[PDB]
Design a protein around this ligand. Structure first.
Ligand SMILES: [Pt+2]
Ligand SMILES: [Pt+2]
Ligand SMILES: [Pt+2]
Ligand SMILES: [Pt+2]
Ligand SMILES: [Pt+2]
Length: 200
C-alpha cells in the first residue's frame, strides 16, 4: 500500500541520499532505479509509479528529451524533476515540457523529504506564480469527470480511490486514459485547464 517512486538519474551520491530520506517515511517506497533514460522509460511504463523522480542533469544533455519520451507513454503518476538550477527559465521549461514540479539538489534533507513525500503521497497544487505559464500553453465518462475534479484539487491516486470507492488500479487506468484522451500531458496541466475554463 505505500506510494511508489521511480528514480532516474546518474548522480550516485544524490541517489544514495534520496534513498536514505525515503527510508524515513514508511508510506513511500522506491520501486525501481535507472541510470539510463531509455531504461527508465521502460520501467516507468510497466510499473506506472505514483512518482517519477527525474534528474535533468544527466550526461549526454538529453534530460529534457527523456521527459518528452516519458510524456509520450501513458502514465498516471506525477513527474518531479531535479532542475539544473533555480533560474526562472530552467524551471518554466521543465514545467512546459510536462513536469508536475521541480526540486533542487541543494535542498536541506528535511525539506527535500517533505517535498518527495508530498509529491508521491500528498496533495500538490501548482503555485499561482507558475500557473500563468501553463495557462499560456493552454466524451468524458461520469467517473472520469469525478476523477478530473479531484485531480484538479491536487489529490493523489490513493486518496481519489478511497473517495470514489474504486480500486487504485482502475483509478490509474482512468487517469491515463482520459489524460491521453483530452490531449493533456500532465496532472498539473489537467488541473490548470479545468480551473481555466471553470468546468467545476
Ligand atoms: Pt533521514
Ligand atoms: Pt527521519
Ligand atoms: Pt528524517
Ligand atoms: Pt492525502
Ligand atoms: Pt492521503
Amino acid at each position: 500500500e505505500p506510494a511508489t517512486i521511480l528514480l532516474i538519474d546518474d548522480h550516485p551520491m544524490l541517489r544514495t541520499g534520496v534513498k536514505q530520506l525515503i527510508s524515513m517515511a514508511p508510506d513511500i517506497t522506491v520501486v525501481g532505479e535507472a541510470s539510463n533514460g531509455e531504461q527508465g522509460i521502460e520501467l516507468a511504463e510497466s510499473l506506472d509509479p505514483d512518482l517519477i523522480l527525474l534528474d535533468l542533469n544527466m550526461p549526454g544533455m538529453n534530460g529534457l528529451e527523456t521527459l518528452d519520451k516519458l510524456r509520450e507513454k501513458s502514465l498516471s503518476g506525477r513527474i518531479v524533476v531535479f532542475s539544473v538550477s533555480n533560474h526562472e527559465e530552467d524551471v518554466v521549461t521543465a514545467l512546459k515540457r510536462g513536469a508536475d514540479g521541480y526540486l533542487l539538489k541543494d535542498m536541506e534533507p528535511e525539506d527535500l523529504l517533505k517535498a518527495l513525500h508530498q509529491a508521491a503521497a500528498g496533495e500538490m497544487v501548482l503555485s499561482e506564480a507558475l500557473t500563468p505559464v501553463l495557462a499560456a500553453s493552454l466524451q468524458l465518462t461520469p467517473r472520469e469527470r469525478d476523477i478530473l475534479k479531484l485531480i484538479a484539487q491536487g489529490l493523489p491516486n490513493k486518496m481519489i480511490a478511497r473517495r470514489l470507492d474504486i480500486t487504485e488500479s482502475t483509478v490509474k487506468v482512468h487517469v491515463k486514459h482520459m489524460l491521453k484522451k483530452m490531449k493533456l500531458k500532465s496532472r498539473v496541466e489537467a488541473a490548470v485547464w479545468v480551473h481555466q475554463e471553470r468546468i467545476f
